Design a protein around this ligand. Structure first.
Ligand SMILES: Cc1cc2nc3c(=O)[nH]c(=O)nc-3n(C[C@H](O)[C@H](O)[C@H](O)COP(=O)(O)OP(=O)(O)OC[C@H]3O[C@@H](n4cnc5c(N)ncnc54)[C@H](O)[C@@H]3O)c2cc1C
Ligand SMILES: NC(=O)c1ccc[n+]([C@@H]2O[C@H](COP(=O)([O-])OP(=O)(O)OC[C@H]3O[C@@H](n4cnc5c(N)ncnc54)[C@H](OP(=O)(O)O)[C@@H]3O)[C@@H](O)[C@H]2O)c1
Ligand SMILES: Cc1cc2nc3c(=O)[nH]c(=O)nc-3n(C[C@H](O)[C@H](O)[C@H](O)COP(=O)(O)O)c2cc1C
Length: 606
C-alpha cells in the first residue's frame, strides 16, 4: 500500500520516516510526529521498509504535505537495514520530485569514518531530485550529546515549518498518552509473554531461522574470568549454537538480549508501590497504526522491566518532561520541567544532573521522592531494551558449533554516589556453565580475512579490541594445518599491565610458538612512567609495515573508537608519508583508498 494513500485516509499531512537500528531514530521520529498537533497539523511516523519511497512523487496530492527523515548511519556510512531499500531506490532513480517538501535530521557519530553519511546522502539526494528543503540538515552527534543536538534542531524546525506553510503554535502544550492500559486479571500462562521477542513461546519452542525477531537460545558452555586482577572483570564466553543452522565467519558480530538486574527491578516496583506481577496490556489509541503494543503483550510489569524496557540509560528530556507532572514538591517539579529547555539552565542541569551523573530512572525517582507516576505510563515513556553486540572471538572453521565472546564488565560509581552496572555484561557474567541460556543472533559484517590466504594481515586491537583477532589467528593457524600457504600474521595488542589484564596470554603465546602468529607485539601502557600504546609499536616497525602494506597486506583495527582508532590511523598516515616519500595529505588519501579497496577495515565502538 501507498503511504501517501494511508495519509489521505487518516487525515495526516506530515510523515516522518525513521532509519533505525537501535530505536533512537524511531523515538525521534515519534516525538516529531506527536508535535504536528501543536502547529495545526496531523503527523504520523513510519518505517520506510514497509512502504515504497517511490510514492514520494504523490505527496503533492495532499495539501501542505511535509516529509521528514530521521536517519541513523551504520557500517561505513551505510543505511540502517530498514532503510536499505530506500537507499537503493535513491541511487537508481531520476524521478522528478518537484513539489515535495522535506527536512532531514541525521543521527551519527563523529568517531566514525563516514560521519552522518546517511542523512547527508538523503538530504543531498532529495534536492538533486527536485524536492524543496524546508529546514537545514540536522547533524546529530552521539559522541557529544545526540539528545541536545536533536532538541536544539527541533526547536528551530517547527518555527521554520510554521513560517513556510502559514500555520501557528496552538500553545496546547498539554499531555497525551499513546497507549491505554488494560489489566488482564483472567489469563492463561500460554497467553502471557515471558520475555521472548516476536511470537509467543518462541523461546520455549525453538524453530529456525533465528534472527533478531526469533533469537536462538544458546547454552553457555564456558564462562571464565580472563584477567588476574579483581578491580575489573574480563570474561570469555562460549555459546553453543548446535542445532540452529546459524552460520558465521570471524569478523561477524553476535548480538544478545540481556535481562535487567532483579534487585533494580524490585526497587522500582517498590518505590512506585506497584504489584510487578500483574499481567497487562498497553494498546495503541491510534487504531490505525501497526505498533499495537509498545512491547510484547500481554505481560507482567516485572517481565516488561526485566526484558523489554531500558531502565538504566539516562532518560531523554521528553521523558523528564512528561514525568514532571507526577511530582508534587514544587522545587522537584521545577527541576524536571526545566531540563527540557534547549539551553539556559535547563540544558545545563540536564547534562549535569542526568547525563554526567548517569542517573537512571530509579535514581531519579529516588532523588525526587515526591515524584509518583503510574507504572503503566512509565512503561510507555521508557525506551525498549536493545540487544548488545560483541565481536565474535572464534573462527567458524575451528568452532562451527560455538560462538565466542570476549567482554569487559561495566561497573562504576557515579557522582550521584551510586554504583551503576552494565546490563548485558553483568547479566552474561552471572550465566553459569553446565539452565544458563543466552538469547542471541549473528549479524553479518564486512570485517573479513583476505580472500587469499597468502595476503599478510596487520591486526591492531588493544583491550577487548583483541576479540575478532582471536578468531582470525585460530583460522590462520588452521589454514596452515590444512597445508596451505599463509602470509604473515601480526597482532599489535595492548593492555595496562602484563600481570593483570593480558587477555588470552597463553593462547596467544602458543600460537606464536606454533608459528601461526608471525609476531606478537604487546604494549603495556602502565608498566613504565609514561604511556606505551599500540601506535607506538606500529611506529617503531615503520619499515616492515610499510613493506607489507605496499605489498598488499590488509589492516584491521578493533576496539575503542574515541581515541585509539584515530591515533592508530594517524600513525599509519605517518608511516605511509615518511616511507612512501609522499606528502601527509597524500598519505591520508592513500589510507582512505585502502578502506575503499577493503584493505583497511574497522570494527570499533564506544
Ligand atoms: C559493534 C560492536 C562491537 C562490540 N564488541 C564488543 C566486544 O567484543 N567486547 C566488549 O566488551 N564490548 C563490545 N561492544 C560493546 C558492547 O556491545 C556493550 O556496549 C558493552 O558490553 C556494554 O554493555 P552493557 O549492557 O554491559 O552496558 P550498558 O548498560 O549498555 O551501559 C553502557 C554505558 O555505560 C556508560 N559507562 C561505562 N563506563 C562508565 C563510566 N565508568 N563512567 C561513566 N559512564 C560509563 C557508557 O555510556 C556506556 O556506553 C561492542 C559494541 C559494538 C556496537
Ligand atoms: O575497553 P577495554 O577494557 O577493552 O580497553 P582498556 O582496558 O580501556 O584499554 C586497553 C589498552 O588500550 C590502551 N589505550 C588507552 N588509550 C589508548 C589510545 N588512545 N590508543 C592506543 N591505546 C590506548 C589502554 O591503556 P591506558 O588505559 O592505560 O591508557 C590499555 O593499555
Ligand atoms: C555498529 C555501529 C556502526 C555505526 N557506524 C556509524 C557510522 O558510520 N557513521 C556515523 O555517523 N555514525 C555511526 N554509528 C552511530 C549511530 O549512527 C548512532 O549511535 C545512532 O544514534 C543510532 O540510531 P538508532 O538507534 O536509531 O539506529 C554506528 C553505531 C553502531 C552501533
Amino acid at each position: 500500500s501507498s503511504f501517501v494513500e494511508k495519509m489521505k485516509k487518516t487525515g495526516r499531512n506530515i510523515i516522518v520516516f525513521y532509519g533505525s537500528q537501535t530505536g533512537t531514530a524511531e523515538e525521534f521520529a515519534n516525538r516529531l510526529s506527536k508535535d504536528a498537533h501543536r502547529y495545526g497539523m496531523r503527523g504520523m511516523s513510519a518505517d520506510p521498509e514497509e512502504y515504497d519511497l517511490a510514492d514520494l512523487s504523490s505527496l503533492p496530492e495532499i495539501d501542505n504535505a511535509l516529509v521528514v527523515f530521521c536517519m541513523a548511519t551504520y557500517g561505513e556510512g551505510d543505511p540502517t537495514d530498514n532503510a536499505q531499500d530506500f537507499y537503493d531506490w535513491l541511487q537508481e532513480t531520476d524521478v522528478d520530485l518537484s513539489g515535495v517538501k522535506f527536512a532531514v535530521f541525521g543521527l551519527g557519530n563523529k568517531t566514525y569514518e563516514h560521519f552522518n553519511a546517511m542523512g547527508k546522502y538523503v538530504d543531498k539526494r532529495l534536492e538533486q531530485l527536485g524536492a524543496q528543503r524546508i529546514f537545514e540538515l540536522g547533524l546529530g552527534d552521539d559522541d557529544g550529546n545526540l539528545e541536545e543536538d536533536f532538541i536544539t534542531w527541533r526547536e528551530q524546525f517547527w518555527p521554520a515549518v510554521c513560517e513556510h506553510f502559514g500555520v501557528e503554535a496552538t500553545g496546547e502544550e498539554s499531555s497525551i498518552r499513546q497507549y491505554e492500559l488494560v489489566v488482564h486479571t483472567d489469563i492463561d500462562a500460554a497467553k502471557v509473554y515471558m520475555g521472548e521477542m516476536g511470537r509467543l513461546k518462541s523461546y520455549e519452542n525453538q524453530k529456525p531461522p533465528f534472527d533478531a525477531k526469533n533469537p536462538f537460545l544458546a547454552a553457555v558452555t564456558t564462562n571464565r574470568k580472563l584477567n588476574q586482577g579483581t578491580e575489573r572483570h574480563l570474561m570469555h564466553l562460549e555459546l553453543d549454537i548446535s542445532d540452529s543452522k546459524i552460520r558465521y565467519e570471524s569478523g561477524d558480530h553476535v548480538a544478545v538480549y540481556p535481562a535487567n538486574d532483579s534487585a533494580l527491578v524490585n526497587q522500582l516496583g517498590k518505590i512506585l508501590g506497584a504489584d510487578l506481577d500483574v499481567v497487562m496490556s498497553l494498546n495503541n489509541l491510534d487504531e490505525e497504526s501497526n505498533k499495537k503494543h509498545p512491547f510484547p503483550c500481554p505481560t507482567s510489569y516485572r517481565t516488561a522491566l526485566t526484558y523489554y524496557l531500558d531502565i538504566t540509560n539516562p532518560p531523554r528530556t521528553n521523558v523528564l518532561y512528561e514525568l514532571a507532572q507526577y511530582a508534587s514538591e514544587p522545587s522537584e517539579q521545577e527541576l524536571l520541567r526545566k531540563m527540557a529547555s534547549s539551553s539556559g539552565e535547563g540544558k545545563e542541569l540536564y547534562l549535569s544532573w542526568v547525563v554526567e551523573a548517569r542517573r537512571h530512572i530509579l535514581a531519579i525517582l529516588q532523588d525526587c521522592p515526591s515524584l509518583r507516576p503510574p507504572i503503566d505510563h512509565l512503561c510507555e515513556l521508557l525506551p525498549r531494551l536493545q540487544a548488545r553486540y560483541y565481536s565474535i572471538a572464534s573462527s567458524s572453521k575451528v568452532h562451527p558449533n560455538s560462538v565466542h565472546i570476549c567482554a569487559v564488565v561495566v561497573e562504576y560509581e557515579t557522582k550521584a554516589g551510586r554504583i551503576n552496572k552494565g546490563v548485558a555484561t553483568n547479566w552474561l557474567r552471572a550465566k553459569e556453565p553446565a539452565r544458563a541460556l543466552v538469547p542471541m543472533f549473528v549479524r553479518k559484517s564486512q570485517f573479513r580475512l583476505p580472500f587469499k590466504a597468502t595476503t599478510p594481515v596487520i591486526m591492531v586491537g588493544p583491550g577487548t579490541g583483541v576479540a575478532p583477532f582471536i578468531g582470525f589467528i585460530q583460522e590462520r593457524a588452521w589454514l596452515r594445518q590444512q597445508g596451505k600457504e599463509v602470509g604473515e600474521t601480526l597482532l599489535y595488542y595492548g593492555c595496562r599491565r602484563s600481570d593483570e589484564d593480558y587477555l588470552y596470554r597463553e593462547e596467544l603465546a602458543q600460537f606464536h610458538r606454533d608459528g601461526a602468529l608471525t609476531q606478537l607485539n604487546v604494549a603495556f601502557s602502565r608498566e613504565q612512567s609514561h604511556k606505551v600504546y599500540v601506535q607506538h609499536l606500529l611506529k617503531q616497525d615503520r619499515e616492515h609495515l610499510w613493506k607489507l602494506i605496499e605489498g598488499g597486506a590488509h589492516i584491521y583495527v578493533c576496539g575503542d573508537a574515541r581515541n585509539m582508532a584515530r591515533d592508530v590511523q594517524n600513525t599509519f598516515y605517518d608511516i605511509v608519508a615518511e616511507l612512501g616519500a609522499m606528502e601527509h595529505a597524500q598519505a591520508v588519501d592513500y589510507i582512505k583508498k585502502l578502506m575503499t579497496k577493503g584493505r583497511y577495515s574497522l570494527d570499533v565502538w564506544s
